[PDB]
Amino acid sequence: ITAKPAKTPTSPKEQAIGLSVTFLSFLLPAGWVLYHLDNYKKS
Amino acid sequence: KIKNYQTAPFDSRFPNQNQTRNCWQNYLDFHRCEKAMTAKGGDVSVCEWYRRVYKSLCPISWVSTWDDRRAEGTFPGKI
Amino acid sequence: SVVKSEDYALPSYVDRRDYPLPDVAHVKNLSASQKALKEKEKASWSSLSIDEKVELYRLKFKESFAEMNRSTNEWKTVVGAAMFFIGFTALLLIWEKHYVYGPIPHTFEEEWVAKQTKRMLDMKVAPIQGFSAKWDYDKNEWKK
Amino acid sequence: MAYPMQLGFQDATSPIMEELLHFHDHTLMIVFLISSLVLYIISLMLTTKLTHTSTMDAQEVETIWTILPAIILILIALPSLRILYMMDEINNPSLTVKTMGHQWYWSYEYTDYEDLSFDSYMIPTSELKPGELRLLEVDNRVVLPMEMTIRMLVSSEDVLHSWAVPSLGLKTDAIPGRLNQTTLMSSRPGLYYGQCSEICGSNHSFMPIVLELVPLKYFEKWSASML
Amino acid sequence: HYEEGPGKNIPFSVENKWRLLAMMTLFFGSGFAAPFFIVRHQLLKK
Amino acid sequence: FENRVAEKQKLFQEDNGLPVHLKGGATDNILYRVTMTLCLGGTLYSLYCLGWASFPHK
Amino acid sequence: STALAKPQMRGLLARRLRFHIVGAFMVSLGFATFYKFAVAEKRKKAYADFYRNYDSMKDFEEMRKAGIFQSAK
Amino acid sequence: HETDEEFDARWVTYFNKPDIDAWELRKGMNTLVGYDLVPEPKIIDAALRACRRLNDFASAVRILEVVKDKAGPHKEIYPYVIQELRPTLNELGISTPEELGLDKV
Amino acid sequence: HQTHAYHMVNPSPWPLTGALSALLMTSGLTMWFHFNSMTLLMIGLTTNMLTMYQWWRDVIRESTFQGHHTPAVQKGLRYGMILFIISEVLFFTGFFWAFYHSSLAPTPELGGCWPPTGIHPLNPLEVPLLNTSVLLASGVSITWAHHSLMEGDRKHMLQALFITITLGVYFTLLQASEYYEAPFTISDGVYGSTFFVATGFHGLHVIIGSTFLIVCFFRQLKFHFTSNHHFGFEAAAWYWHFVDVVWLFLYVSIYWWGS
Amino acid sequence: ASAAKGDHGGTGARTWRFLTFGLALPSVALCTLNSWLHSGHRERPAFIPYHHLRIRTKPFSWGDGNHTFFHNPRVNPLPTGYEK
Amino acid sequence: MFINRWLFSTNHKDIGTLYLLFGAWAGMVGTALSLLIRAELGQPGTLLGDDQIYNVVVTAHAFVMIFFMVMPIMIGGFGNWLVPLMIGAPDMAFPRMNNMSFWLLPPSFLLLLASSMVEAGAGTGWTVYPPLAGNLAHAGASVDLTIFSLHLAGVSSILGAINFITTIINMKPPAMSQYQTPLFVWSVMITAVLLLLSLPVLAAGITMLLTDRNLNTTFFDPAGGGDPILYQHLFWFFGHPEVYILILPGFGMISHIVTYYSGKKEPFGYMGMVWAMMSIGFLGFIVWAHHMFTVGMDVDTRAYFTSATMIIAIPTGVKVFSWLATLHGGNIKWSPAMMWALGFIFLFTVGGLTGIVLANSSLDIVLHDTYYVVAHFHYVLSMGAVFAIMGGFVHWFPLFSGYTLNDTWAKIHFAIMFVGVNMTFFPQHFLGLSGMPRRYSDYPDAYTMWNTISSMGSFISLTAVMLMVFIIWEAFASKREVLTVDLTTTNLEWLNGCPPPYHTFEEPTYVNLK
Amino acid sequence: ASGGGVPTDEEQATGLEREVMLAARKGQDPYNILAPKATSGTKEDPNLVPSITNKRIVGCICEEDNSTVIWFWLHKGEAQRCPSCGTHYKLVPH
Amino acid sequence: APDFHDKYGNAVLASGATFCVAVWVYMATQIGIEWNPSPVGRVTPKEWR
Ligand code: HEA
Ligand SMILES: CCCCCCCCCCO[C@@H]1O[C@H](CO)[C@@H](O[C@H]2O[C@H](CO)[C@@H](O)[C@H](O)[C@H]2O)[C@H](O)[C@H]1O
Ligand SMILES: CCCCCCCCCCO[C@@H]1O[C@H](CO)[C@@H](O[C@H]2O[C@H](CO)[C@@H](O)[C@H](O)[C@H]2O)[C@H](O)[C@H]1O
Ligand SMILES: C[C@H](CCC(=O)O)[C@H]1CC[C@H]2[C@@H]3[C@H](O)C[C@@H]4C[C@H](O)CC[C@]4(C)[C@H]3C[C@H](O)[C@]12C
Ligand SMILES: [C-]#N
Ligand code: CUA
Ligand SMILES: [Cu+2]
Ligand SMILES: [Mg+2]
Ligand code: NA
Ligand SMILES: [Zn+2]
Prior knowledge:
The structure holds 13 protein chains of 13 kinds. By secondary structure, chain C is mainly α. Chain C is built from five helices and two strands, in the order αααααββ. In chain C, a hairpin with a 4-residue loop joins strand 1 and strand 2 (141-142). Chain E has one domain (1-46). Bound molecules: heme-A, decyl-beta-D-maltopyranoside (2 copies), cholic acid (CHD), cyanide ion, dinuclear copper ion, copper (II) ion (CU) and 3 more.
């Protein structure tokens, strides 16, 4: 396929931000639940 | 009379993995026979083979439930 | 030259080694000197210079076969990045072991395992191939 | 039982399970060959700059592509079905034992002669004796005579369960209102383990099966002592 | 009628890549988080 | 009765840009609002009931 | 400077395919012989050797003396 | 089907049509390179002279490139074909891709 | 402007209101079965009826009043209706499978017999035979209605369609009476289960089919149908013959052979 | 079968009306008479609390939980027998 | 305008987009459930301390991945976007009913989440067998909410099947026969026929389960003369067609992708590919009881089902070898979508072969209800359906969006996923052969090593999924607009540009008969 | 036995249905219900492709029973050729 | 002109491989994971009864 150059280029720094934010959105809530599992088996 | 019974023999009427009807039929046969004998004055001893076969094959709880329902008048098979 | 989205229904240029003569020329608009070169092309090509022959080629085509078929260093980036992210996964697994998982059952204690091993050999677990077959009951040791 | 890092089947304890091992070896060889051939042809198709993109005639090569797989399937099916029917062959048992599944334990009934029955529960991990196997031991084993053909009858008094012993090649679902038959014959004494094999609720993982295979005269005395 | 073209044939905006990152983060993050919070919910009942 | 299909054809072909579900006139709008109100309100109520039923009664 | 000889110019893809499909076949045979030898036959022999002089009562007595049984001490 | 010679002959005839047009030149070469073969010198000769009648020097060079490409790893084919074509190349003043530097990546 | 013959439908809210009505009916049944309340279920039934009414109203507006049902569109609707009927046949097939499974292999709990001990089936020569004659007759009268419409005969179309509907109603009333009089219930083991669930879904389809015929009756009164264009009538007739055939299989299987 | 009738000199509305009034509705009338001659209550049988009948694994979602939806006191016993 | 366009749609592309968004969200739910499974199993002992919750997680994992991820993406998403374009049609036959097939799925998913929130969830397995799923062993609303979720998903797909069959039969150019339509179109038509016939039988079975649970019927309860095994027959009479429904559109997309990146105008052996898919469809209705070889069936029935099941390898093999024959001679373009398709061909072949192992009822006695089955079907589903989905998504993302992905990132994503899924599922073969049951929250200690590796593999695929989200973000963030796409003469769906206008084929194509 | 009272299509068809019906009576196919029959397809005798705009997509089934259809835009102007078989097509806008 | 891969491919390959090996070796050996390998050739059996 051919394509135009990016209309809004995403620099390496911007990609590092988007990737980090994406990973944290998956990892932090699950990590919070799993870290607190023992707390939950208490009630 | 053909004792040395070890266990219930293969029965060509019931050759498949599902043995429910084998247990059921021998339970019926025993109790039908015991009815005809206690009635006509004879000896339940002729019924023994069916007794041994159903006792070998049938789960205790099935026999127990069926016996309870015969006592209650709710047994749905014909005896 | 400049390809536009609104051109999608018109014949277009491609560099493909299996489609050597595309549907249009790479360059359609010609300068004065480029016009003169196309007129010279109607005479003997032996009279064209090397540079003129190259410019005729580059008007017709964008990349040569050697250019369009060149290999790249992309595999280094792909493999290296994939190993990075696989390595990052092990960080997640380290975090899980440290903060999520508690102790495993006491049956993995070394003395339990040694006793359980003897008892498996005492009951001849897998004595044909799998387990006790690998124990020498005469010499009281694992077979060599 | 299985052992650490095991790749294949548990060692066979019965002749049928021996049969299954050789049949699996036969089939897995075919599986490896076809998988490898596909991987190899993929790589061959992908490793040349030579091209041929015009239309290719298909009906010659599709004869090969159907006939050879059909032959291979027949070479699998023939031994497969031979074992199937040999498993089903009459062998007249010396003993009948019933097992009833429950949430979450098995009961056993040996009612050919006397009214012998008992429950069989997993040993909890905190109560294992040293050297005993976690999640596999039971309090009351299914003692059985070795080297004799035994009729198992399997049912349930609640939900579905399934009574399995891999090293004997056994798995028979336990269905309420139904009496399923299988046959068991151990070539050897010893302890043979299995686990409930139809999901039955929250302790499905924790209702195992332990067969204890001993000589007939020990089985008779154990039977008497269990009345 | 409706807008046509790249970035216009979708029910979410791509006009600002950082707003988009937030929206995609909430969207896929909520789906991925939900089972963990259902497990927490069931554990916290008993 | 008399065949008044022509009158209805004129009405529903009038060049007024209305979608077919509203092109009968203001009664369509009323019936649409009742339907959508019952659907959206009922859906919120069902979510309330889920919240209620999600706990042993805590 | 001598001329170059005419090389084969046609059917190069088909020729390559023919040669390697045959090689693929010969390997598959060579592997089947190896797998029968390293796995299937090994298994038949292990089971036959194991049971040839197997004494089930001696095995039981060993297990019984090791203390493994509920029914036999 | 048809002999090799019969195949080559109807491709020679195709490109030798005196009033062959540009579309037909492209259609011919783009169809030809789909087959499992490197075209015989006599076919390439006819195609190059069609380029000449169409006053298209660049397509003549591109045809030489696609000959080299169709040979794949058979590195001996292209030099043989160029050898067989040198009288035509000289006559028509066609420079090879190598003489033009177009083989550099 | 298009130059194909197919129908680009105006954007519509009824797919969403239908989907939400499905949510409300199912969560409503859950609330009724487990939380002793009919409220959600009643809202869902209401929104479902409103959705069906406005959706099919709009199809009538698009076809009779706006002219979008070209022959190509009508041909697609023919396929759609046939495929819908096929899916409904397979739905009934599952209940017939259940019936034959249980009756061909009656378990010990039944007495090991069919019909089970303690079950006294209806006499298939009484109301069940009457119901059979009623639905068969209605297949004849709906065929008369179809031919009258094709022949351009308004009065006899209406008369034959009215007779068809009356018979559908007669079947429904007879079946409701039989339900009340039956000495067995849906809780009478697998005999009652198969009997009432299979005849009950069939009765629901008779009610659906009768409603569809009634829609056609009022559309006919309003002159919507032409002598050559009347697919809603054809679809209702196909659906009605499906309902008749399902009854014949129920009669032979459950009422007669299962007695 | 060809049935035993036999018109097809062309098909139409007139033939299907003929079949409607000449065969189909007469059949309904005859079956309606047959049914009205064998209506009248069958005497209900002794109640026997068979365990495969009168199933109750969960109360019904209406009434007192113990009555089927179209319960008929004359012929439908409860698990405990006929109603009073 | 937003509500008119996105809630009241009658447009096949926008509806397709809704389905792809829905399916992608469901895929994150299903992936999180799969990671909870593997976390519980990743070391010996108990993690949740509540195996009812474990069972609920396993059950929901399957329903989400099947009904809310694979079927909506393949049929609702790629089917709606591509089928009308590939036959030159202006939309689907029933464009408004099509929107209700979409909007039934969020309520279906809501019912499934409700089942997991109320009471203790439906910890049943996705088979929902009674009596475990009945009102004594699963009292309360959870299982009924699951049944109703299935009802709504079933209606959505039945109506969708009616739509696709009608569209594909009725709305081609008048000169185009069925043997001139692309293979993906065939694959959707055949999937739709399987859905039409099979889902009503599931609907009948789960309805019977609903009435046994709430109306005191006894279809499945021996106390009333019922039979739990009848439910299994009805379920699997649907469930075997279902596994072919899950893969057939994938086969269609793989044909297109392999043809395209081989530089070919057509797949090898078109009519054999049509024959093979039709044969697979037909045979897919006569094999179901291979899901029941341990229930106590007569030996001759087990011999028939063994034999009929094996027959399927013949037409499936024709398709595999025809994909290889499509590669043959190609100008191979090593695009990320090509990598997905090549991974598909090999990993699908592995899983199909272990399925042939399982078809042997005598061996299936030992392998049934063990991880060998889990390994079989995750090779055909996670390395078959998912790889075809990822291949089609990467391939057609520029058509749907107008923007290009970064190909290097997409190749990195493929590489991570390929490692992760094989590390996850390959060791499960050993666990199954050595007797580890499926549906277990913990295992005898001998099974520890392979469960540990399998769980570590599951985290690698998590990293791939997170990266996929970033890659989609980067493409919309950078806005590289498509210019030129090769091979439009044999890939009609690209010929209206990227993205195609809201209305396409307002003037239909011209195709003469000659 | 036989009044009237049922409208005919001639009386009551409307909208696009009526346009199709009237055009068919005239032997015309403005809404593309029929497959066009090919000409010999030479440059002298090109297939004539009606359009309401200045381009239309052609699909060419080059040989009878080919399963592969060859798709391309035909534009107003000089006839164009199928890229697979060369048969000629010319747009006739109206 | 040189692209991303020409400029950084070597370093990405080297660093990624080194990082991957180091962190998986650490995870596998240093944090207390019980792989439960076979006792064959490894465990001295000990009296249990
Ligand atoms: C995409 C989904 C999918 C697909 C396509 C398949 C395909 C097949 N499966 Fe699969 N299967 C499942 C998903 C699938 N399966 C699921 C989800 C389950 C579990 C359900 C549950 O219990 O939850 C399952 C369970 C399952 C069982 C039950 C095992 C048990 O529970 O004990 C069996 C048994 O016969 C089986 C067999 C097969 C076969 C023979 C195929 C065949 O169609 C495969 C044919 C393919 C090939 C053979 C490879 C390509 C062919 C060649 C290269 C030609 C040459 C080959 C030969 C000559 C052999 N499957
Ligand atoms: C299958 C899913 C895979 C998911 C793998 C998750 C990888 C880890 C992501 C990190 O998650 C965070 O981890 C912190 C610990 O590192 C937690 O902080 C917790 O622990 C801290 C340190 O002890 C305290 O400071 C905080 O208050 C306390 O919430 C925090 O809540 C959680 O969001
Ligand atoms: C605007 C669009 C549509 C939105 C409609 C929203 C309607 C909200 C109605 C809420 O009313 C509730 O109704 C419950 C039932 O739903 C009642 O429960 C009652 O209902 C039962 C029977 O009818 C009784 O048995 C129980 O005691 C009792 O809790 C309860 O008092 C009340 O909180
Ligand atoms: C008023 C109407 C005339 C219809 C018309 O031509 O406008 C006539 C013609 C056919 C009639 C219907 C048919 O005769 C069938 C029914 C006969 C019943 O005796 C009355 C209602 C019944 C439904 C009739 C009502 C009414 O008299 C109808 C509808
Ligand atoms: C697989 N079935
Ligand atoms: Cu009992 Cu699983
Ligand atoms: Cu299957
Ligand atoms: Mg099972
Ligand atoms: Na665990
Ligand atoms: Zn052509």
